[PDB]
Amino acid sequence: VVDEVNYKDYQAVTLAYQHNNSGFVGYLAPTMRQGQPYPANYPYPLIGKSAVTSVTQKKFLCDRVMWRIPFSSNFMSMGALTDLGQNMLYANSAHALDMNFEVDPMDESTLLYVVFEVFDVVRVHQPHRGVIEAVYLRTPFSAGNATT
């Protein structure tokens, strides 16, 4: 896009004072044509002779993907029960976890969805006809860990 400081003929024209397809399209509305055939003045050239000085803007989109960071010393998991999940059977006693995050401003309220990846064991047994039993256990975050 145009470099608005190092282009010396940069005029900031608003939507109202932009024209392009003059005489062949409506005035700021999906309605019938209006105006006269006339030179445009809207986009600034970025190509060919008479191209304006420009800046570079770069970004990415990730849609349908949650960011994930494995809890493994090397950040690839070669087993579902991580190597640092098994250093918490000898060097654990409970620790605090504080996570800080920096996000872009949003003009509306947003939520952060943090998922703490665990084991959800749903385990079920029948010992007799018409009898069903179960025990449900999870490891780093679990229910029934401060009440019966």
Binding site: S77, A80, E117, F119
Partner: peptide
């Protein structure tokens, strides 16, 4: 990965003469 090791017994298929049959608990 996201959790999926919830897999079968790591058997192999039962041996036969003429490609298929059933032997049950044998």
């Amino acid at each position: 990965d996201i959790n999926f090791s919830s897999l079968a017994p790591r058997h192999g298929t039962r041996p036969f003469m003429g490609t298929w049959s059933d032997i049950g608990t044998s």
